[PDB]
Design a protein around this ligand. Structure first.
Ligand SMILES: *[C@@H]1O[C@H](CO)[C@@H](O)[C@H](O)[C@H]1NC(C)=O
Ligand SMILES: [Ca+2]
Length: 476
């Protein structure tokens, strides 16, 4: 699927090993501290697609699929998929090729997209760099395919970042020499064949900043689908230019201020407002970025605060910001694990309740976004516009005039007081009736064009014209 196709999507990102087991058990042990395979499979995903689609997600992103190093290293097993050794074999822990094809088929039967995580930068090896036996890598079974062994010491030295090997010296990540035509050709052929083999609709590309930029346009082209790159850096002046060589990047610039704004009742709305505006104006296309506040490489949101209202506001922002929402499996069950490995909790241990607080919030937010998009072909290309902020509030507007969603977010938390915010600049006509879709209530725009937004319990408010909602099952 093209970048234009992907703009409307909403992604549930999951770890294959940790989302669902073939036997569907909700009690199977998964102690994250052990850092061992817990048994999640591709077949498990298929069996739980109703759970994912009931939240209004239109796509999944799954961790890498290639065969991994076999060892339990000092840092655990390769359950996460980022330590590949044989790119022409699948990771048997997750199932067979027929299972992976069955997963893409099942998603397509539901009108959903499959996004697969891929690594081009490195292989993986249990041991120090000097102990690597290059003959275990397929097809790159020789030192000649790799950069000389060095480590990345200074992330301001872009040559080091690209040419040196990742990690400390415990589990080596041999760095492929992606400047060699033999490596480009192999990777390009591989990725095109992967996408075709398995009818993949888009790719998430790992470790993008660690490969020189001239590699990525050909890789994205060979893939034939939308590619969103992991460029792990909060500085938009560094990260957003990667959109000149790839369709999209993960919105790490927004990540850091977004977390700070909502992780406590003293978070800075100013910093989030400012970063929204910087990304919107300076990044090549904010509507092709992926918005997130939770993933497998940072502490989960609830590790910072268990306040359910703060979690609802950040989840609402992720769904209604420019670009593609990305929710990390477990976020909807208020998982609270800290840094790796603690943030790789097994989703099945929640019991997959479809009535949890954040399941419902996410279902409502995706519902209105999916509905609004189906009625407004300009929603996804209308750049989100922050229209108001104060010490505890940020309000934003997105969508064509007459059909815009106006979202009011708050960091007052669950004990927030009850008051009315007179919101100016929402662009609705006087007397427009609006539905607040999270709580299924109504507000009418005042004669002065201001919206009287009831605020209470620090809850997010998502407004959309009642006429436009018409006879949808949202708030029926
Ligand atoms: C694509 O399918 C062919 C089977 O005709 C297989 O040989 C090839 O390795 C596959 N490529 C990938 C990347 O899976
Ligand atoms: Ca590299």
């Amino acid at each position: 699927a093209t970048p234009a196709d992907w703009r409307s999507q909403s992604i549930y990102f999951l770890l294959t090993d940790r989302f669902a087991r073939t036997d569907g058990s909700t009690t199977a042990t998964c102690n994250t501290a052990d850092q061992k395979y817990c048994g999640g499979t591709w077949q498990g995903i298929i069996d739980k697609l109703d759970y994912i689609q009931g939240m209004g997600f239109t796509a999944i992103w799954i961790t890498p699929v290639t065969a991994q190093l076999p060892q339990t290293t000092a840092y655990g097993d390769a359950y996460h998929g980022y330590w590949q050794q044989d790119i022409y074999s699948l990771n048997e822990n997750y199932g067979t090729a027929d299972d992976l094809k069955a997963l893409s088929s099942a998603l397509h039967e539901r009108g959903m997209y499959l996004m697969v995580d891929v690594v081009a930068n490195h292989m993986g090896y249990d041991g120090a760099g000097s102990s690597v036996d290059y003959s275990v890598f397929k097809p790159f079974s020789s030192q000649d395919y790799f950069h000389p062994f060095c480590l990345i010491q200074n992330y301001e030295d872009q040559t080091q970042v690209e040419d040196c090997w990742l990690g400390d010296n415990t589990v080596s990540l041999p760095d492929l020499d992606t400047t060699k035509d033999v490596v480009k050709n192999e990777w390009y052929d591989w990725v095109g064949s992967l996408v075709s083999n398995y009818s993949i609709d888009g790719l998430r590309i790992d470790t993008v900043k660690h490969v020189q930029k001239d590699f990525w346009p050909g890789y994205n082209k060979a893939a034939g689908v939308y590619c969103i790159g992991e460029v792990l850096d909060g500085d938009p002046a560094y990260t957003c230019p990667y959109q000149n060589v790839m369709d999209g990047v993960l919105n790490y610039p927004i990540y850091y201020p977004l977390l700070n704004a909502f992780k406590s009742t003293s978070g800075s709305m100013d910093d989030l407002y400012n970063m929204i505006n910087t990304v919107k104006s300076d990044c090549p296309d904010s509507t092709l970025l992926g918005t997130f506040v939770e993933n497998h490489d940072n502490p989960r949101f609830a590790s910072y605060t268990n306040d359910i209202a703060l979690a609802k506001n950040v989840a609402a922002f992720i769904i209604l910001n420019d670009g593609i929402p990305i929710i990390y499996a477990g976020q909807e069950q208020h998982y609270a694990g800290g840094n790796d490995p603690a943030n790789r909790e097994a989703t099945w241990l929640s019991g997959y309740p479809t009535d949890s607080e954040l399941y419902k919030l996410i279902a409502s937010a995706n519902a209105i976004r999916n509905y609004a998009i189906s009625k407004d072909t300009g929603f996804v290309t209308y750049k989100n516009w922050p229209i108001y902020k104060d010490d505890t509030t940020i309000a934003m507007r997105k969508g064509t005039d007459g059909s815009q969603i106006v979202t009011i977010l708050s960091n007052k938390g669950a004990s927030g007081d009850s008051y009315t915010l007179s919101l100016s600049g929402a662009g609705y006509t006087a007397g427009q009736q609006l539905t607040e879709v999270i709580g299924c209530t109504t507000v009418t725009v005042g004669s002065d064009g201001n919206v009287p937004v009831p605020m209470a319990g620090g809850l997010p408010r998502v407004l959309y014209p009642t006429e436009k909602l018409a006879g949808s099952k949202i708030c029926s």
